[PDB]
Design a protein around this ligand. Structure first.
Ligand SMILES: Nc1ncnc2c1ncn2[C@@H]1O[C@H](COP(=O)(O)OP(=O)(O)NP(=O)(O)O)[C@@H](O)[C@H]1O
Ligand SMILES: Nc1ncnc2c1ncn2[C@@H]1O[C@H](COP(=O)(O)OP(=O)(O)NP(=O)(O)O)[C@@H](O)[C@H]1O
Lengths: 928, 928
C-alpha cells in the first residue's frame, strides 16, 4: 500500500472543463438510458418541483453536461427543471395508453422527468443517462435526497465539501501514473495474457429481467452462510454465479466484470454525485474439489484483484484489446453489487412503490445485479434478449436459485457445500432427454447368419444379390455360403477366429461374409486397393491366417505366403451344401473393421441385430425393397448393406467395382434395377442427384428411402433429391464405427433456413446420446460438449488387441455407471430432444532493440518482441529503469509513461518509433 | 510565367545547416560512386596537391558533408585534402595489379583522390559520391577548375557571389509552394494519372557501357538534321531513343526520365558547385504516321513539360508512387543530356586522356548520356548488367546507331524521316529467324483417304484399329470405309458436303471418317455427350443433313427429324465393298472442327497431309508403332490420331469411352497393347505417369514417343515420364485448331532450371512462327508480342460460313504479304530460334465530405473520393478556394499546403483527419 497524494479542491475553476472518467468515456462512444417508474396515490406537484429545483442546485453533477469536444463542465445556472405532466384521468384503458409511451449527454438535462396523472393514483417516471452518475450515486445520493426533499424541500443537506470535478482531476493527474498505480499496473500486466475470455454461452441465429427478492430472514441466513466460509455476501454470490455459468459455458474458465464503486475515503466524497465505477476483471478458473472450496478460492482472487484497484479496469480492457481483438476483449458478463456500501438516509421505496425499471446498458449481455432494498436483498439478472439461445438465461436462473436455495438449506460442511458439482440441467432438460433416450429394447439372440438362412428358407427363389449380369437367388447364395462355411469349418476356423475378405464389389463378398459366420468366425474386410503391403500389415496384425478373395484378383495382391488364400468362386465348388449348426454366441464378434496405428473395431452379432431390426421397423423395409450396396465392405457403412435387406427377403443390387465416383453408372443402375433404398455418404448422393438433374427421364424415381451420413449433409441436397425422386424420404444419420454403422437418425422432412447444419438426430433402439462436459457429466440444453454414446449392446466390444485404448474411449459414465463410447464429436442438445453436430520494419529493429535491453535488465537469455514486459518478469521498480536504459542507449527521451502505457515490447518500440519528441534518433540507433 | 521571388544571399549562416535537395534526398536512402581515371606521362604532384587545396577552399560544395540527422553544412576548415599515392613502378604486370584495386556522405571528403605511379606514365583516379554535385557541376565547375588550377594553382577564379546553401534554401522556401510552383503543380497533377509506366523491357532469370563518339563533322550534320525539324539535338536524340526503345518494350507507351539542370539564371550561380538536377517525366506516346512526325510531336511535349519545371520531378515521383506502387512509379530509363549548357573554360580532356569512367547510379537500369566533348558528341548508354535479357541492350544500341546513321544519310523529308517505322531486329535476329523458318516443302497432292487405301493394299492383313476386344485389320477397315463411302455417295454426298460423326470412342469413328472422305465429303465430329440439343445446334448450323452414329448410342441423341441418320455398324452391311474413285481435290475440306458463337475451323487435305508427313519423318513413325487414340474425334488433337498412323501401316489402339480420366485403364492398355506413341494434353500424361509410379511393374515401358500439348507442360513431367518409360522421347507441341493439330515442336531433352516454361518450340514443315507487335510487325529477340503462324497450306481454309471473322484472324502480314493466322497467343523469340509461350472509416466520411465540396466547387454532378483534384478539373486558383471552403465547412484550418501536397481526395481527407492542428473537429463535422 503505497500511500496516495491528497486532494486539493480547486473551487476557482468549479465550472472549467474536466475529462470524462474512463468508465464514462466508454459510454460516450457506444441507446443507454436507465429508467424508473414509481406509483403513488397523491403527488404534490408544486412540492415535487420545489424538490427537484433544490436538487439540481445542490448537486453539481445534476448540472453537468458533456461538450461536443468530448469533455464536460458544470453549468452555473441551467434553467428550471423540465417536468412534463401528462393528464390521463379522463381516458378509459389509460394504463394501455400509458405503456404505449416508449435523451443525450450533449443537452442538459441528462435526465427526463415526467408525471402521469391517472384515476386515483399517479406515476412518477425518471429517465437517466448511464453516464450521468454511477449506480451508487443514484441510490446513495440522488434517491436518498429526492426523498428527503419531497418531504421538506427546504430541509438541511450536508454541505458539499469538494467538487466531483476536483475528484476527477485528482484521479487522472495525481493518481493515474503515481507510485501506487504503477505497482498495481504491474499486477495486472503480469496477469493479463493469462486472463480467459468472457463466458462463452450459447447464442441464437432489448433487455429482459429475471428476479428474486430474499426476505430479511433469508438474507440474514445467507450472510451467516457466507461468513461461515469467511466470505462476504457478494463473494458468495459471485462464486455461486460462476458455478452456475459453467453449466452452459464452452470453457470452464471465463473472466467476469465485477465493478466496485470505491471513492477512496476522500473527506466529503460520500455526498458527491459522480461516477465511481471501476470494473475489475475477475479470472474465474475452477479451483477446488468441492463447491465450497472453489467459491472460497475465487473469493480470494477477487480480494487480491481488488487490493490493486487503483488501476481502473477500463485501462486493463484497453490493453487486453490491443493484444487480442476488440471482440476478444469484451467483458459483457457483469456482477454489479451495491452491497458493502454506506447505508443511506432514505430509500426510494419510501417515495413510491416501484412499477417499472430497466437499466439497459450497452455492450453488456448479462448483468447480475446484487442490491439491498428494505432489508431484503434483490437478485436481478438483466439480460439482452437475443444474446443467447432460447431459454439459456431462464434455465440458468433456475439453476442459480436452486444452488442458493441449497446453500440456505444445507449446513456449512455438508450437502451442497461439499458436492463435487451441482447438476445444472433444468426439469425440462432431464424430462426431454429421458423421453428421447428411453430406447431399451430386447434383441433376440438370433445370430446374424442364422437370420438370413431362415430368410433363405422362407423365400428361396427370390432375388438375393443382383450384381453385374448375375442374379444370385436366396437359395443360390445360401448354398454357396454353406460351401464356404463347411470348408472353412473343416480347415480350422473355431469361434472367435478372423478371416480376411480382400475383394472388390461383387456377390463373392456376401458369400464370404455369411460363410465365415456360418463357420463360426468373424470377417475382417480389407481394401482390395490398399497401397504397398498394408493388406499384409493388417492381416498380420489382426491375426487372420485365412483370406478369402476373388479368382480375378488373386495375383494382384501382396499376401504373405504362410497364410492360406482361397477364392470364393472356384476353390469351393466341390464342398458340401449341407447346413451348418451355429457354434458362436450372439455376443461373439461378427466382424472387425479397421479405422485410421490403425485400430480394429470389434463388433458382436447382437448390436448389429439391433440395427437391422431398428431400420426394418423404423423405415418399413419389406422384401419388395432393393438396396444399392455402394459403400465398401471395409467401411462401417456397408454393415447395414450386408445384414439388413438380406435378413428380411429384400434384394441387394451390387454396383460394378469403382475407383472413382461414377454417378452416370449409378443413376442408370438405380433406373434399371428399380432401386428403392440408397445408403452412401452425402457427397455421393449429391453426385447421383447431380447426374439425374442433367437427364430427361426421372432415373431416380424408384428411390423411396435415401439414408446419408458420414460427413456434412449440404442444406440443399434433401430438397434436390426429393425432386429427382418424388416421395423420397431423405434420412440423415451418423455415429462412428464403434457405435455400429448408424446409431441415430434425423428424418429430413423440411430444412429450416435458420439452421446451419441438419440436426444430427435422435438415438436408435438401445442407443443413448449424452452430451457431456470434460468430466463426463451431462450438460444442459444448448450447452456444447462431447457426444458420449451409451449402450450395453450397441457399442463395439472394444479395440482389437488393445485393452488400453479401449479403456480410454469406452468408459463408465460416472453419473450412471453406463458404459459409453466417447465419440470425440462435439455438439449440443436442442430443445426438442435432437442433437446439433458442431465439429471435431524500422519498428521491427527498435523492437529487437527494446527486447535486448529488456532481456539484459531482467536477467534472461532471450526475450521476444511480442512479450509483455511485466509478464516477462518486470515489476514497477524495474519498469522505471527500462525507461532509463532506453534513454541512454537511444539518445532519445523515453518517458516513464511511454514504458507503462506500452507493456508489450513491440508496442513500446512503435510508441518510441512514432514519438514526435525523438523517434528518428531512436530509429537510427536501432539499425545497429 | 508567374515571376519568381529573388534570392537573398544569407552569408551570416554560410555554415549553418540546410536541407538536401530532393534529388539528393533520394540518393541518401538508396553503392553510388561515379569514377574517373585519367592517364598522363608526368604529374607534378606538389602542383596537383596545391591545385586541390585551392579547389577545396574556393568551392563550398567541396567542403559540404551530410550530418547523421539527414541535413548538411559547409565545414569552414576541413583539413588537408587526402591524396593517396601508390608507387607501382618496380612491379612487372603493373596494369594487372592496378585494375585489381576494386566512401560515404557522412565523412568528409565526399571524394577519393589517388595517383598511381607506373613506368613512364601516371594514373589520376578521382572517385565522387553522386550526391556531392550533379553532372553539370562536375563538368562545368570542378573539371574546368581542376584544369585551370593544375596549370596555375594561384590563377584567378571568378568570385563566389552566393552560397549553394543560399540557392538551396531559396528553392525550398521561396520557390516550392509559391505562385509559379502551384500553376506548374496543377500541370503535373492534371497529367499524372495518365502517365504510362517506365519502359517495359525484357528481363533475365554491375554497370556496362555502350558508346559511340560523333566526330565534329557528323555532330554538325546531326544538328542541321535536328534544326531542319525545329528540334534541338537533344530533342532529336530523345525522340530517336524512344523509337528504338519501342522495338523491345511491351507497350509502345512509356515514361522516360529526362533530367534538366536549370539554375534559374540566378546571378553568380554559373560558378557554384551544387546539385541542380530536376527529373522530368516525359510521356512518350507514339503520335504520328512517320518517324519524323513522331519525333517532332514528342519534342513538343518535352518542351511543354519543361515550361513547368519549377516543380521538381522528384515530387511528381512521390505523388505517382502514392497512387501506384513504389515499383509502379520507378522511372529507371533516363536520358541525361549535358547539351544546351554554357561552354566551360577548360575541358578535362586537356588534363589526361580518359582511361576509365563509370557513373553507376542506383535505381537506374539504363541511362542514355548525351554529352559534348572536344567538339565531338559522346553517346553513352550505361546499363545495369542483369537488368535485361542477354543481348537486349547490345541489340538496341545497334538499332539506335543504325537509326541515327540513317538520319545522317537521309535528307529531311525523305528516307528514314518519312518511314512508317524502322525494323529493329538485329542482323542476328533476322539470321536466326530465317534459319528457323525456312520450312517450305512440297506436299504431294494425294488425298487423305487415298493414302490409307494405298496402305491397306500394301499391308492388308495387318492390325489397323485395335479397340475393345475387336481388332480391325487394314483390309477389314478399308472394306467398311468403302461400304460407308459407296452408300453415302449414292445418297447424295457431293464434294464439299458435311457429314456429322456423333459417336463415342471406337472403330466406328475411323470407318465413318474414311468413308465420308471416300465419298467426297468432309467429316464434322460432334461430341456424343453434348448437353441439351447442342448436337442439333451445330448440325443445323454447319449444314450437315447426314449424321453417322453408333447402333448402341442412336436413341440417346436429340437429332432433328429431317436429317438422315445411319449407324456405321448395322445400316451398312449390304453395301458394296467396291473401291471409290476420289472426286474431291487436295485443297477441298477434309473436316470441320468446332471451337468455342462457336466457330467452325475448316481444314483441307493438303495441310493435314503436311502434318502427317512431317511427323512420320521427324519421329520415325514405322508400322511397328502403336498409337493410343485418347483425344476425342471432336478435338483438333485427334486429327493426327485419325490420319497419322493409318497412313504408314501403324496400329491405332482405341481406348474404351470415358467420361472422366481413368489412368488405371490407360496404363494397363499401354501395357497389354504394347503402345509406343502417346498423344494427349499434358495433365492426362501426368495422370498416366502418376498411375505407373504406384505400380510394381513398368506398365509404360513400351512408350517410345509421347507428344503432349494444349496446356502448360509441368516442369517435372518430362523427367517423371522418362523414368516410367526408359528411352521415351517427350515432345512438347502446340498450335491452335486453325494451324492443324500440331504446328511446332520442342523435343524436351533436358529441362533447364532457369526456365519458367518449356520452350514452345520451332515450326514444322510449311509453318512459320512470327512474333509481331500490335501492327503485325516482327519483333526482335526477347520482345513480347502476338504469335502469328504464317503458311499457304498449313492453316485452316477459314471459319465456316463467316468471311468476316476469317478476314480478321487470317490476315495478310504487311511486311511480306504472307497469309498468317493470329493465334491470340503471346510469347517471345528466344536467342536459339525457339519461342517461349507467355500467356493469353472516419476518414471515409471526411473523404465523402472533401469530394462533395470539390464537386460543388468545380461544377460537377458526382466526384469520386479516389479522384485526383487537379485531374477532376481543378487548377491552381481553384485549389486555393478548396482550402478556403473546407476551412469554413469543417471549422478547422486547412492550409493551402495541405490541399496541394494531397491532390488525391482520399489522401486530403486522411491529411485533414490526422492533422494534429484540427483533425478531431474535422472528423466530427464529417459524420453529418
Ligand atoms: N451428419 C453428419 N454431419 C457431420 N459429421 C458427421 C455426420 N455423420 C457422421 N459424421 C462424422 O462421421 C464420423 C464417423 O466416421 P467413421 O464411420 O467412424 O469413419 P471416419 O472416422 O470418418 N474415418 P477414420 O476415423 O479416419 O478411420 C463421426 O465421428 C462424425 O464426425
Ligand atoms: N505447351 C503449351 N503451353 C501453353 N499453352 C499451350 C501449349 N500448347 C498449346 N497451348 C495453348 O493451347 C491453345 C490451342 O487450343 P485449341 O486446340 O485451339 O483448343 P482451345 O482453344 O484451348 N479451346 P477453345 O478455343 O475454347 O475452343 C493455344 O492457343 C495455346 O494457348
Amino acid at each position: 500500500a503505497a500511500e496516495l497524494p491528497p486532494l486539493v479542491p480547486e473551487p476557482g475553476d468549479a465550472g472549467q472543463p474536466f475529462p470524462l472518467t474512463p468508465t464514462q468515456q466508454a459510454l460516450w462512444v457506444g441507446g443507454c438510458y436507465g429508467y424508473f417508474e414509481w406509483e403513488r396515490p397523491e403527488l404534490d406537484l408544486a412540492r415535487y418541483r420545489r424538490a427537484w429545483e433544490r436538487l439540481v442546485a445542490h448537486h453539481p453533477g445534476l448540472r453537468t453536461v458533456v461538450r461536443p469536444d468530448g469533455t464536460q463542465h458544470v453549468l452555473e445556472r441551467p434553467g428550471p427543471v423540465p417536468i412534463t405532466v401528462e393528464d390521463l384521468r379522463q381516458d378509459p384503458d389509460a394504463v394501455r395508453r400509458l405503456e404505449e409511451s416508449r435523451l443525450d449527454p450533449g443537452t442538459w438535462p441528462m435526465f427526463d422527468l415526467r408525471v402521469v396523472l391517472l384515476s386515483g393514483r399517479v406515476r412518477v417516471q425518471l429517465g437517466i443517462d448511464l453516464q450521468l452518475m454511477d449506480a451508487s450515486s443514484l441510490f446513495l445520493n440522488l434517491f436518498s435526497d429526492l426523498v428527503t426533499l419531497y418531504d421538506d424541500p427546504d430541509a438541511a443537506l450536508a454541505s458539499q465539501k469538494l467538487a466531483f470535478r476536483d475528484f476527477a482531476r485528482w484521479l487522472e493527474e495525481d493518481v493515474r501514473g503515481g507510485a501506487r498505480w504503477r505497482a498495481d499496473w504491474a499486477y495486472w500486466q503480469e496477469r493479463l495474457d493469462g486472463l480467459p475470455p468472457a463466458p462463452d454461452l450459447p447464442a441464437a441465429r432489448k433487455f429482459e429481467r429475471c428476479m428474486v427478492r430474499c426476505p430479511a430472514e433469508e438474507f440474514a441466513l445467507l450472510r451467516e452462510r457466507a461468513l461461515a466460509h469467511g466470505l462476504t455476501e457478494t463473494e458468495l454470490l459471485v462464486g455461486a454465479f460462476a458455478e452456475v455459468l459453467r453449466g452452459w459455458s464452452s470453457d470452464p474458465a471465463f473472466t467476469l466484470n465485477v465493478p466496485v464503486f470505491q471513492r477512496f475515503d476522500v473527506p466529503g466524497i460520500e455526498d458527491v454525485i459522480g461516477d465511481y465505477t471501476n470494473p475489475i476483471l475477475l479470472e474465474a478458473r475452477p479451483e477446488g474439489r468441492t463447491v465450497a472450496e472453489r467459491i472460497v478460492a475465487l473469493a480470494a482472487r477477487l480480494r487480491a484483484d481488488t487490493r490493486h484497484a487503483s488501476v481502473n479496469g477500463v485501462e486493463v480492457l484497453r490493453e487486453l484489446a490491443r493484444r487480442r481483438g476488440l471482440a476478444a476483449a469484451a467483458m459483457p458478463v457483469v456482477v454489479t453489487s451495491l452491497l458493502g456500501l454506506p447505508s443511506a438516509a432514505r430509500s426510494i421505496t419510501e417515495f413510491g412503490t416501484e412499477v417499472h425499471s430497466i437499466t439497459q446498458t450497452p455492450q453488456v449481455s448479462l448483468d447480475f445485479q446484487i442490491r439491498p432494498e428494505d432489508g431484503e436483498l434483490r437478485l436481478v439478472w438483466d439480460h439482452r434478449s437475443g444474446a443467447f439461445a432460447p431459454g439459456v438465461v431462464e434455465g440458468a436462473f433456475e439453476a442459480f436459485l436452486d444452488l442458493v436455495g441449497r446453500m440456505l438449506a444445507d449446513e456449512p460442511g455438508h450437502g451442497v457445500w461439499e458436492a463435487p458439482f451441482a447438476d445444472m440441467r433444468s426439469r425440462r432438460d432431464r424430462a426431454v432427454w429421458n423421453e428421447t433416450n428411453d430406447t431399451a429394447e430386447p434383441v433376440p439372440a438370433v445370430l446374424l447368419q442364422e437370420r438370413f438362412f431362415a430368410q433363405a428358407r422362407r423365400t428361396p427363389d427370390a432375388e438375393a444379390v443382383v450384381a453385374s449380369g448375375l442374379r444370385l437367388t436366396y437359395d443360390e447364395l445360401a448354398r454357396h455360403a454353406y460351401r464356404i462355411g463347411n470348408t472353412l469349418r473343416e480347415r480350422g476356423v473355431r469361434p472367435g477366429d478372423l478371416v480376411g475378405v480382400v475383394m472388390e464389389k461383387g456377390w463373392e463378398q456376401y458369400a464370404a461374409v455369411y460363410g465365415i459366420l456360418a463357420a463360426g468366425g468373424a470377417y475382417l474386410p480389407i481394401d482390395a486397393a490398399s497401397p504397398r503391403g498394408r493388406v499384409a500389415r493388417l492381416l498380420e496384425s489382426a491375426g487372420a491366417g485365412i483370406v478369402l478373395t476373388q479368382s480375378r484378383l488373386r495375383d494382384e495382391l501382396d499376401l504373405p505366403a504362410g497364410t492360406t488364400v482361397l477364392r470364393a468362386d472356384t476353390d469351393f465348388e466341390t464342398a458340401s451344401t449341407a447346413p451348418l449348426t451355429p457354434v458362436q454366441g450372439p455376443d461373439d464378434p461378427a466382424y472387425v473393421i479397421y479405422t485410421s496405428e490403425p485400430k480394429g473395431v470389434v463388433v458382436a452379432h447382437r448390436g448389429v441385430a439391433n440395427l437391422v431390426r431398428d431400420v426394418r421397423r423404423r423405415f418399413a423395409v419389406t422384401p419388395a425393397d432393393r438396396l444399392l450396396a455402394l459403400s465398401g465392405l471395409h467401411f462401417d457403412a456397408s454393415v447395414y448393406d450386408v445384414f439388413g435387406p438380406l435378413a428380411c427377403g429384400a434384394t441387394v443390387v451390387v454396383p460394378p467395382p469403382f475407383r472413382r465416383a461414377e454417378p452416370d453408372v449409378w443413376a442408370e443402375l438405380v433406373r434399371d434395377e428399380r432401386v428403392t433404398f440408397w445408403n452412401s455418404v452425402p457427397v455421393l448422393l449429391e453426385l447421383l442427384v447431380g447426374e439425374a438433374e442433367s437427364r430427361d427421364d426421372r432415373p431416380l424415381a424408384t428411390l423411396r428411402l435415401a439414408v446419408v451420413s458420414g460427413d456434412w449433409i449440404p442444406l440443399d441436397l434433401p430438397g434436390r433429391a426429393r425432386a429427382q425422386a418424388p416421395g423420397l424420404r431423405v434420412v440423415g444419420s451418423g455415429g462412428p464405427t464403434e457405435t455400429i454403422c448408424w446409431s441415430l437418425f434425423h428424418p429430413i422432412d423440411a430444412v429450416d433456413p435458420q439452421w446451419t447444419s441438419i440436426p444430427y438426430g435422435k438415438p436408435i433402439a438401445n442407443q443413448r446420446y449424452y452430451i457431456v462436459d470434460r468430466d463426463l457429466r451431462p450438460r444442459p440444453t444448448w450447452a456444447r460438449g462431447e457426444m458420449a454414446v451409451a449402450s450395453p449392446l450397441g457399442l463395439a466390444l472394444g479395440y482389437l488387441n488393445d485393452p488400453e485404448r479401449t479403456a480410454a474411449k469406452f468408459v463408465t459414465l460416472p453419473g450412471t455407471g453406463e458404459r459409453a463410447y466417447l465419440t470425440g464429436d462435439f455438439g449440443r442438445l436442442l430443445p426438442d430432444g435432437g442433437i446439433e453436430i458442431l465439429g471435431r520494419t524500422d519498428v521491427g529493429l527498435l523492437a529487437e532493440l527494446v527486447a535486448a535491453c529488456v532481456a539484459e535488465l531482467l536477467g534472461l537469455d532471450e526475450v521476444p518482441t511480442t512479450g509483455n514486459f511485466f509478464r516477462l518478469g518486470g515489476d514497477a521498480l524495474s519498469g522505471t529503469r527500462l525507461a532509463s536504459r532506453l534513454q541512454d542507449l537511444l539518445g532519445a527521451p523515453v518517458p516513464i509513461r511511454t514504458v507503462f502505457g506500452n507493456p508489450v515490447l513491440g508496442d513500446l518500440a512503435s510508441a518510441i518509433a512514432g514519438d514526435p519528441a525523438a523517434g528518428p534518433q531512436a530509429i537510427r540507433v536501432a539499425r545497429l
